[PDB]
């Protein structure tokens, strides 16, 4: 239970993934040339989880970069940390996928997927003990959505007993490339429900609102959104990347977080919320980290946690601080808001600490909630879907690539089922 294999697919998958490797390469003290100049071997003790060791004792991210078009991956090879990536692991067609789930999953993507699986197989064959896979992608376009889920299916086929983990960005009309996004997302959520162990629902809606209402950015870019995403990714992978009490891996996270196999859509939350470049200097005290990280304004999925109940909660606190104070505050939220945690899962809030804070802060806390309020997200996607599907609008773009209306009706149905199960447990009482 050491190595993880990271795949980033499509425009969004690759921009957020590149930011991920920038951030964590900085945390592990590895420079854009892949060399290491850090001062704590707490930085190298589990560096193998995300990096292979190469000649010169260089460190190469266990990363596969996938796109149906060369635009964004060219820009990754150009960007700050581009040359850290193993060049063979850039796998790209020239087609593009046209924001079209069908081209990603059935036509254009089918042509490229076996090459991707070749690089995957070569990265795994070297793993001393692979724990599984983590994918970054959006569900609104076509490559990341359609091909990304195609990939997840083929990986579960070849490695049915390895953990499948995604960071999947949901679409919002507030941050919207195309009108067919609710179609693509519904089609992928279906896949995700059957085919992943743990999904981080990163709502582009919530990222826009954090940027706008809380960080005071009036015109947010995808860069301001991806700053928040890369902070959350750092936080939720801290337990995996640094030595600790917990000795954390993807499987124990799944076992303790997912009481029911389909209900594995996690709501992430970060504190303190931070604009890029803004050097803010006030110490955050542990009561402040706790209150903020549970605040709905700090969640990356645009749901109201008080409209649901927490099935499970996992938390990481970063920085030099009192673990006594941490236990005190975590107990205090549970005991002061006990209504919002299911009583039929005793002691369902688990907490970890790491000495090393992220770049820029002295203290920080990341939150993973398996909440029933996540249904609000899927309901929103569903309405936007039905609004169009009731008139079969835009459907031709998909039927032209071999798809049948029935497939859409199946996917709509499975998502409405997911919503119903979440509601089941939101009303269940021991």
């Amino acid at each position: 239970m050491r190595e993880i294999v990271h795949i980033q697919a499509g425009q969004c998958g690759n921009q957020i993934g590149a930011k991920f490797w920038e951030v964590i390469s900085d945390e592990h003290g590895i420079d854009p040339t892949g060399s290491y100049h850090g001062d704590s071997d707490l930085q190298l003790e589990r560096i193998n989880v995300y990096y292979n060791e190469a000649t010169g004792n260089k460190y190469v991210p266990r990363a596969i970069l996938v796109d149906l078009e060369p635009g964004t991956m060219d820009s990754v090879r150009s960007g700050p940390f581009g040359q850290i990536f193993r060049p063979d692991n850039f796998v790209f067609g020239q087609s593009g996928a046209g924001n079209n789930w069908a081209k990603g999953h059935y036509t254009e993507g089918a042509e490229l997927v076996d090459s991707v699986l070749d690089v995957v197989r070569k990265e795994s064959e070297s793993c001393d003990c692979l724990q599984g896979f983590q994918l970054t992608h959006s569900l609104g376009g076509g490559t990341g959505s359609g091909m990304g889920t195609l990939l997840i299916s083929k990986i579960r086929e070849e490695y049915p007993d390895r953990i499948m983990n995604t960071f999947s960005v949901m679409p919002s009309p507030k941050v919207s490339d195309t009108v067919v996004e609710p179609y693509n997302a519904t089609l992928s959520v279906h896949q995700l429900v059957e085919n992943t162990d743990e999904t981080y629902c990163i709502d582009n809606e919530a990222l826009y609102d954090i940027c706008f209402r809380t960080l005071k950015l009036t015109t947010p870019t995808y860069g301001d959104l991806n700053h928040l995403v890369s902070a959350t990714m750092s936080g939720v992978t801290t337990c995996l990347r640094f030595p600790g009490q917990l000795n954390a891996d993807l499987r124990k996270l799944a076992v303790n977080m997912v009481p029911f196999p389909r209900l594995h859509f996690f709501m992430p939350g970060f504190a303190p919320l931070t604009s890029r470049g803004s050097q803010q200097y006030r110490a955050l005290t542990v009561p402040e980290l706790t209150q903020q990280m549970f605040d709905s304004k700090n969640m990356m999925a645009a749901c109201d946690p008080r409209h649901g109940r927490y099935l499970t909660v996992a938390a990481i606190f970063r920085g030099r601080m009192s673990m006594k104070e941490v236990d005190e505050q975590m107990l205090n939220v549970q005991n002061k808001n006990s209504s919002y945690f299911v009583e039929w899962i005793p002691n369902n809030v688990k907490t970890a600490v790491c000495d090393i804070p992220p770049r820029g802060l002295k203290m920080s806390a990341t939150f993973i909630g398996n909440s029933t309020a996540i249904q609000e997200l899927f309901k929103r996607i569903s309405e936007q879907f039905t609004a169009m599907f009731r008139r079969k609008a835009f459907l031709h773009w998909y039927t032209g690539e071999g798809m049948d209306e029935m497939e859409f009706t199946e996917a709509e149905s499975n998502m409405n089922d997911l919503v119903s199960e979440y509601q089941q447990y939101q009303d269940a009482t021991a």
């Binding site: 236990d327 107990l331 205090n332 549970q334 006990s338 009583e343 005793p346 021991a430």
Partner: protein, 352 residues
């Protein structure tokens, strides 16, 4: 915001306590099965003391004392009084009492019962007895085999106790009564007597030669509201409070309530509770107990007080509900859980 739960819906007293708690503005009621409570107002039977005091960051407190049933079951009370040295066989304020199991089972005190019985036959003395269980199945008779008949007629263990045949009778009425005192024991084992007690009266002249008609022999509010013709004549609820009883003692007997009765009541209360203290104290425990008790007393013609039973889940009299419950929050609950006297502390250290 302190938090509490409610597992005895039928409880008059703690229904009121729950209402006052919510109206503090700083106490939240949770659902019956939520473990993350400060205060359990618990059930009467099978209260799960095993689960209390294991919630980190929660000081937990409960309104019952594990082990207190030894005092509040008549069989256990007889066993505790005759077995605990600090109480003794040589105990001036409990009626001579024996525990009798029914025939079916065939340890029981029956053959030791009739041995003292027959010396009361031998001695020309009054040998009328009471049998009761823990207006139901009460029989008073001077024939042993009458009751020994009756007790096995019903398949539960009973106690045969001496019947107090010359009781104090209020005039006008020539009629019986018992006294109900309310005692609160807090988490520190402070013993708090409530200033207000009540006399549950009979409204029917006591009659010594017909023991079976029991409206002149049993002062229970139920029996009083049912078979008694004269319910409500002298007192409103067949209840006389302490101002009036004190005044009547002053006018008719030239004593007061404290001197003639209340000293003995305080002696009995603090002896009975200081006895069981080491078996029930939650001093160094991981959860904490208080409990409200109802002690029930009889005064005979000599102004001697006899304990007849301790009640573990007592109802208050309707006039007093407010005051006592306020008190319960003040000293039982608020002492452990502070926010933003109507009791007498029972304490005494005579040196010897």
């Amino acid at each position: 915001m302190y938090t509490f739960v409610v597992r005895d819906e039928n409880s008059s007293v703690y229904a009121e306590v729950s209402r006052l708690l919510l109206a503090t503005g700083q106490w939240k009621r949770l659902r019956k099965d939520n473990p993350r409570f400060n205060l359990m107002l618990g059930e009467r039977n099978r209260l799960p003391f095993g689960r209390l005091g294991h919630e980190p960051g929660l000081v937990q407190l409960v309104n019952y004392y594990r082990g207190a049933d030894k005092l509040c079951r008549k069989a256990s009370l007889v066993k505790l009084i005759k077995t605990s040295p600090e109480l003794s066989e040589s105990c001036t304020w409990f009626p001579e009492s024996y525990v009798i199991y029914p025939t079916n089972l065939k340890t029981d005190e029956r053959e030791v019962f009739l041995a003292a019985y027959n010396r009361r036959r031998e001695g020309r003395e009054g040998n009328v007895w009471i049998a009761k269980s823990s207006g139901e199945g009460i029989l008073i008779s001077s024939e042993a085999s009458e009751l020994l008949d009756f007790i096995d007629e019903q398949g539960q263990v009973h106690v045969i106790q001496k019947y107090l045949e010359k009781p104090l009778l209020l005039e006008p009425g020539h009629r019986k009564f018992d006294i109900r005192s309310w005692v609160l024991v807090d988490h520190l084992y402070n013993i708090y007597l409530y200033r207000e007690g009540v006399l549950r009266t009979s409204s029917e002249p006591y009659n010594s030669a017909n023991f079976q008609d029991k409206t002149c022999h049993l002062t229970n509010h139920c029996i009083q509201k049912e078979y008694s013709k004269n319910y409500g004549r002298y007192e409103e609820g067949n209840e006389m409070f302490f101002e009036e009883f004190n005044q009547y003692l002053m006018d008719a007997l030239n004593t007061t309530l404290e001197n003639s009765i209340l000293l003995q009541i305080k002696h009995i209360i603090r002896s009975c509770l200081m006895c069981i203290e080491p078996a029930i104290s939650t001093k160094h425990l991981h959860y904490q107990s208080f409990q409200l008790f109802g002690f029930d007393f009889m005064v005979d013609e000599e102004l001697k007080v006899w304990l007849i039973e301790v009640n573990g889940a007592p109802a208050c009299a309707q006039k007093l509900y407010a005051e006592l419950c306020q008190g319960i929050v003040d000293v039982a609950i608020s002492s452990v859980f502070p926010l933003a006297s109507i009791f007498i502390k029972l304490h005494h250290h005579h040196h010897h």
